Amino acid sequence: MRVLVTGGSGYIGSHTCVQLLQNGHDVIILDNLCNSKRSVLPVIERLGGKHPTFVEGDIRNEALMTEILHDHAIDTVIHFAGLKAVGESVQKPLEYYDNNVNGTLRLISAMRAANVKNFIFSSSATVYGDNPKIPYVESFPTGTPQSPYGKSKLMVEQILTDLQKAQPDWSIALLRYFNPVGAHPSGDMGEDPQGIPNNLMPYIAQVAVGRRDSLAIFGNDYPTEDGTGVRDYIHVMDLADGHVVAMEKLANKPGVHIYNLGAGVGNSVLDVVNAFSKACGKPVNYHFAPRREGDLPAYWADASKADRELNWRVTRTLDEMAQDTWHWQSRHPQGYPD
Amino acid sequence: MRVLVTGGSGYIGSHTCVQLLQNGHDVIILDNLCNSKRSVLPVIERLGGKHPTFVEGDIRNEALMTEILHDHAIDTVIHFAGLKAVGESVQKPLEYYDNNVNGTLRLISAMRAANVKNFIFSSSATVYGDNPKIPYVESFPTGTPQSPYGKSKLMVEQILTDLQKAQPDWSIALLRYFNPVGAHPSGDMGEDPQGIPNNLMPYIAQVAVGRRDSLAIFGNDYPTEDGTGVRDYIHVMDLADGHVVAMEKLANKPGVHIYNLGAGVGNSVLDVVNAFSKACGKPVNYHFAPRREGDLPAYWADASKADRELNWRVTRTLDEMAQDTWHWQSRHPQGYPD
Numbered sequence: 197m198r199v200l201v202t203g204g205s206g207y208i209g210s211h212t213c214v215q216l217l218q219n220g221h222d223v224i225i226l227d228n229l230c231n232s233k234r235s236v237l238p239v240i241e242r243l244g245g246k247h248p249t250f251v252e253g254d255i256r257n258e259a260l261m262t263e264i265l266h267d268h269a270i271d272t273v274i275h276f277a278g279l280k281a282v283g284e285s286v287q288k289p290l291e292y293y294d295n296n297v298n299g300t301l302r303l304i305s306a307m308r309a310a311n312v313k314n315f316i317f318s319s320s321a322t323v324y325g326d327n328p329k330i331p332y333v334e335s336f337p338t339g340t341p342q343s344p345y346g347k348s349k350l351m352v353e354q355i356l357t358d359l360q361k362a363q364p365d366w367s368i369a370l371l372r373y374f375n376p377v378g379a380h381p382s383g384d385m386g387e388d389p390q391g392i393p394n395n396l397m398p399y400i401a402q403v404a405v406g407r408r409d410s411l412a413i414f415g416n417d418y419p420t421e422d423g424t425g426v427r428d429y430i431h432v433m434d435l436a437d438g439h440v441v442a443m444e445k446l447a448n449k450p451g452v453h454i455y456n457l458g459a460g461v462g463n464s465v466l467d468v469v470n471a472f473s474k475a476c477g478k479p480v481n482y483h484f485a486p487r488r489e490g491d492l493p494a495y496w497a498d499a500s501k502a503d504r505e506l507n508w509r510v511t512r513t514l515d516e517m518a519q520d521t522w523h524w525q526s527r528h529p530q531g532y533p534d
Numbered sequence: 535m536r537v538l539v540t541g542g543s544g545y546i547g548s549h550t551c552v553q554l555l556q557n558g559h560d561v562i563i564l565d566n567l568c569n570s571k572r573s574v575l576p577v578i579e580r581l582g583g584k585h586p587t588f589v590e591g592d593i594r595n596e597a598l599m600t601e602i603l604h605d606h607a608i609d610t611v612i613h614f615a616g617l618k619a620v621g622e623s624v625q626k627p628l629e630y631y632d633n634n635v636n637g638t639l640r641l642i643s644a645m646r647a648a649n650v651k652n653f654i655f656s657s658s659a660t661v662y663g664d665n666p667k668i669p670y671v672e673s674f675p676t677g678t679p680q681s682p683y684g685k686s687k688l689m690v691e692q693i694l695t696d697l698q699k700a701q702p703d704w705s706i707a708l709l710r711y712f713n714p715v716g717a718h719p720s721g722d723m724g725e726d727p728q729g730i731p732n733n734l735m736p737y738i739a740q741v742a743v744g745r746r747d748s749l750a751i752f753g754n755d756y757p758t759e760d761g762t763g764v765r766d767y768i769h770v771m772d773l774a775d776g777h778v779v780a781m782e783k784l785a786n787k788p789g790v791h792i793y794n795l796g797a798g799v800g801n802s803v804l805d806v807v808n809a810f811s812k813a814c815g816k817p818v819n820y821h822f823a824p825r826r827e828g829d830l831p832a833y834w835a836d837a838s839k840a841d842r843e844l845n846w847r848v849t850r851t852l853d854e855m856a857q858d859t860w861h862w863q864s865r866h867p868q869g870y871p872d
């Protein structure tokens with residue numbers, strides 16, 4: 197199929213594009229380069245074993261979206277474009293709402309005009325908010341997320357849902373996931389945070405490489421087996437894979453298809469650290485701090501539905517996530533070249 | 535003060551503008567005329583006893599907003615502009631999200647750029663959704679509204695709230711209300727629905743004037759005193775007044791100020807009908823139908839907080855709401871002239 201991949205040069209999108217191309221689809225990448233570099237492109241093509249057309253531009257530009265859609269005769273859209281830094285969302289809520297809420301709205305408005313009706317939304321499990329019972333199941337009502345980031349994601353899920361109700365011929369997947377980690381096995385693609393890394397893994401990696409001194413561990417008194425927070429980490433390759441299957445299998449199948457993408461288990465902060473020490477051949481430095489801001493003791497997603505329905509499940513381990521991360525870090529210490 | 539009144543030529547805004555001008559503020563009206571006519575303008579000026587500057591344009595046009603803001607040195611913005619037809623929201627969700635969510639976002643983005651930090655949001659009590667205990671109190675968490683209309687309102691409330699958190703010097707009022715009815719006492723301004731009227735009152739009025747045959751009453755078996763739905767109706771003049779006080783009193787007072795605007799009591803469908811029969815001098819025709827779509831038995835707002843805090847409370851009766859409505863209908867059967 198002809199797939200427009202918004203945010204394709206980013207972390208998860210870049211990995212998703214390689215997999216798309218490997219499956220032989222025709223890939224059109226749309227990215228504004230606000231959080232990714234052109235230098236990834238060629239790696240994409242190479243590992244993908246095929247050429248992905250690249251378009252520099254913004255989802256908020258509805259006109260341009262429509263153009264692209266028509267110009268390329270798109271069948272489906274996988275939408276990764278957006279902003280995803282939680283604390284930054286609290287400081288700059290407007291930007292988050294503009295990029296995510298209006299950004300997606302502009303994007304689907306254009307699809308409508310261009311008559312594109314297949315969509316894969318890269319959601320977030322933050323949507324469950326404090327509406328648990330854990331692990332989270334797609335049948336659980338969402339709760340109220342705490343940052344503007346979380347809220348923007350649920351808002352978009354809601355909009356898409358209503359849209360689908362009004363235009364029942366649309367196929368929309370809401371892919372909810374938690375913590376994407378790792379990197380392509382080649383070691384030539386991986387997560388390239390620009391500043392202080394958001395996620396645990398990269399933060400750890402930077403400590404490990406000497407860029408950081410010690411990992412602050414927030415709260416060593418949670419009601420967990422080791423006292424640290426328990427989260428759900430998913431290898432970015434498994435995630436990429438989820439995206440492709442979801443895209444291939446749901447195209448032209450009307451409805452709102454909600455699926456948690458995860459390993460179906462949680463790992464504590466120490467488990468991740470220890471996995472990483474083992475990966476990089478040396479003890480990661482860390483210390484304990486008091487319980488953080490918007491953090492809970494433990495949560496992870498129930499991924500039974502995608503297994504049953506898409507026949508998808510993760511295949512990589514936490515140890516590989518660590519290794520693959522160390523591998524990329526170690527091969528391209530400076531990340532993507534300018 | 536210098537107030538930009540978005541959606542000022544509409545129903546509630548037009549009444550609010552008259553009151554503003556009477557208080558002697560400098561009024562700038564911004565409206566796209568999608569649901570109002572220029573013909574209201576002169577009536578505004580007249581009843582207002584002053585000249586309101588009019589700008590034809592859209593809230594979604596951020597550039598234009600910023601321009602206006604600067605050009606007029608605005609102190610505060612009262613925001614009524616948007617779409618508000620519930621069933622239409624289900625059919626055309628995108629338009630509702632664009633106009634309301636993106637429309638407000640564009641508007642406040644512009645304020646930011648123009649350094650305007652006083653805002654009065656014309657909210658809706660639909661935000662409480664099914665998160666009751668009734669009557670609703672500002673201290674009650676909101677629930678999940680059922681139409682895209684309701685959801686768009688809560689989304690906007692959320693955005694503003696986060697914005698205020700990030701930019702603490704902003705003063706933002708979230709004015710929640712239910713059913714605005716009635717018309718200016720002059721009989722020269724009132725609600726002018728274009729097609730099949732949304733609200734009970736006008737629908738009734740049209741039946742009364744002969745434009746409609748019979749009022750369908752949805753559900754005569756609710757757990758209410760008379761078996762029909764109990765709602766909260768508020769004379770548009772009292773609402774206008776609420777808006778002015780809120781605007782005068784909260785300017786430069788940082789925070790998110792939430793206030794229910796209502797009479798603090800409910801009236802059933804039959805109570806409204808009977809009030810109207812009495813107003814128009816003849817029995818309104820109606821029949822019963824089965825319980826409607828997104829309708830509950832009874833709800834109204836608790837308006838204690840605005841009384842205590844703004845020293846505001848309604849002063850008009852249901853009977854006046856009916857009379858004032860009949861008065862306008864009767865003086866301008868064709869509504870606003872083209």
Ligand SMILES: NC(=O)c1ccc[n+]([C@@H]2O[C@H](COP(=O)([O-])OP(=O)(O)OC[C@H]3O[C@@H](n4cnc5c(N)ncnc54)[C@H](O)[C@@H]3O)[C@@H](O)[C@H]2O)c1
Pocket residue numbers: 202203204205206207208209226227228229230231232253254255256275276277278279280295299318319320321373374375376395
């Ligand atoms: N990485 C995570 O921890 C996390 C977890 C949940 C959800 N997600 C979601 O996945 C998507 C991106 O995730 P990621 O980790 O690959 O981030 P990323 O920043 O690496 O990828 C996002 C890409 O989108 C681009 N982009 C941002 N705003 C844009 C706009 N308006 N127009 C065009 N391109 C724009 C950026 O330049 C970047 O290449 C978002 O939908 C995000 O909410 C990621």
Ligand SMILES: NC(=O)c1ccc[n+]([C@@H]2O[C@H](COP(=O)([O-])OP(=O)(O)OC[C@H]3O[C@@H](n4cnc5c(N)ncnc54)[C@H](O)[C@@H]3O)[C@@H](O)[C@H]2O)c1
Pocket residue numbers: 540541542543544545546547564565566567568569570591592593594613614615616617618633637656657658659711712713714733
């Ligand atoms: N009337 C009600 O029953 C109801 C109850 C709750 C909330 N409200 C709110 O009050 C506001 C309007 O209420 P109303 O009853 O006066 O409706 P109305 O349609 O009479 O007034 C809205 C005005 O906004 C204008 N408008 C719409 N989209 C615009 C845009 N993008 N740019 C500029 N102008 C635009 C219309 O032309 C119209 O004059 C909205 O915020 C609505 O959600 C009304």
Ligand SMILES: CC(=O)N[C@H]1[C@@H](OP(=O)(O)OP(=O)(O)OC[C@H]2O[C@@H](n3ccc(=O)[nH]c3=O)[C@H](O)[C@@H]2O)O[C@H](CO)[C@@H](O)[C@@H]1O
Pocket residue numbers: 280281282319320321322373374375394395396397399411412413414424425426427428465488491
């Ligand atoms: C804080 C954060 O980024 N929130 C993200 C994440 O939360 P999430 O908490 O799941 O992920 P994090 O990477 O932020 O932290 C994982 C765990 O490690 C801890 N930790 C993390 C970093 C660090 O430097 N030190 C430390 O102790 C936290 O207590 C937590 O218990 O879920 C979403 C997935 O849909 C992301 O899009 C959010 O952007």
Ligand SMILES: CC(=O)N[C@H]1[C@@H](OP(=O)(O)OP(=O)(O)OC[C@H]2O[C@@H](n3ccc(=O)[nH]c3=O)[C@H](O)[C@@H]2O)O[C@H](CO)[C@@H](O)[C@@H]1O
Pocket residue numbers: 618619620657658659660711712713732733734735737749750751752762763764765766803826829
């Ligand atoms: C249906 C509807 O417009 N929803 C509106 C309203 O709901 P709300 O139900 O409060 O107001 P309505 O005018 O729609 O109806 C009031 C009552 O009369 C009944 N009724 C109404 C019309 C009619 O033709 N026949 C009839 O029986 C309904 O059962 C209800 O019990 O609250 C919001 C106020 O914040 C508005 O912005 C919503 O747009």
Ligand code: NA
Pocket residue numbers: 361362624625
């Ligand atoms: Na429909």
Ligand code: NA
Pocket residue numbers: 530531532533
């Ligand atoms: Na770099």
Ligand code: NA
Pocket residue numbers: 286287699700
């Ligand atoms: Na801040």
Ligand code: NA
Pocket residue numbers: 868869870871
């Ligand atoms: Na008319």
